[PDB]
Amino acid sequence: ISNEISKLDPLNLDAFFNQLPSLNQNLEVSLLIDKLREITKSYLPTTFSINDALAATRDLGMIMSSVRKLGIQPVSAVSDLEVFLETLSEITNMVPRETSYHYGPWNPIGERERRFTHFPDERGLIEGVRIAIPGIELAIREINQLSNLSLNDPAFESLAKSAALHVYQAVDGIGETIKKTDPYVFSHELRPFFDPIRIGGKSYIGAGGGQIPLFVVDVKLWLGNHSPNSEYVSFIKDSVFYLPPELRPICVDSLLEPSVINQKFAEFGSVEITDQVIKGMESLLSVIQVLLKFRKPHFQLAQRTLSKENRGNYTTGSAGYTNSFNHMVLEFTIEVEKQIRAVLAPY
Ligand X SMILES: NCCc1c[nH]c2ccccc12
CB 88 within 8 A of CB 53: yes
Contact (Cβ atoms closer than 8 angstroms) between residue 213 and residue 105? no
Distance CA 334, CA 14 (A): 45
Q: Please, what sign has the CA dihedral across residues 197, 87, 56, 141?
A: positive
Residue 74 interacts with, from ligand HEM, ligand X, none (CB under 5-8 Å by kind): none
**The one among 106, 186, 204, 268 contacting ligand HEM by CB under 6 A:** 186
The contact mask relative to ligand HEM for 191-230 (x = CB under 6 A, - = no) is -----------------xxx-x-xx---------------
Classify residue 286 as exposed, middle or buried by CB count within 10 Å of its CB (0-12, 13-18, 19+): middle
Residue 295 contact partner, candidates ligand HEM, ligand X, none, CB within 5 to 8 A by sort of partner: ligand HEM
Integer Cα distance of 58 and 65 in angstroms: 11
**Residue 174 touches which of ligand X, ligand HEM, none (CB < 5 to 8 A by kind)?**
ligand HEM
Non-local (6+) Cβ contacts of 229 within 8 A are: none
In the complex with ligand X, which residue's Cβ is closer, 39 or 207?
Answer: 207
Site string for ligand X, 178-207 (x = CB under 6 A): -------------x--x------------x
Closest CA to 63 of 11, 104, 109, 108: 11
CB of 34 to ligand HEM, least distance (A): 31
The answer to whether residue 173 forms part of the interface with ligand X (CB under 6 A) is: no
Could you tell me the smallest distance in angstroms from the CB atom of residue 216 to ligand X? 16
- What sign has the CA pseudo-torsion 285, 290, 294, 296? positive
CB atoms within 10 A of CB 190: 22
Residue 207 partner contact from ligand HEM, ligand X, none using kind-dependent CB cut-offs of 5 to 8 Å: ligand X
Residues in the site for ligand HEM, rule: CB under 6 A?
125, 128-129, 132, 173-174, 177, 181, 186, 208-210, 212, 214-215, 295, 298, 301-302, 305, 316-321, 323, 325-326, 329
The binding site for ligand X (CB under 6 A) comprises: 125, 128-129, 191, 194, 207-210, 317-318
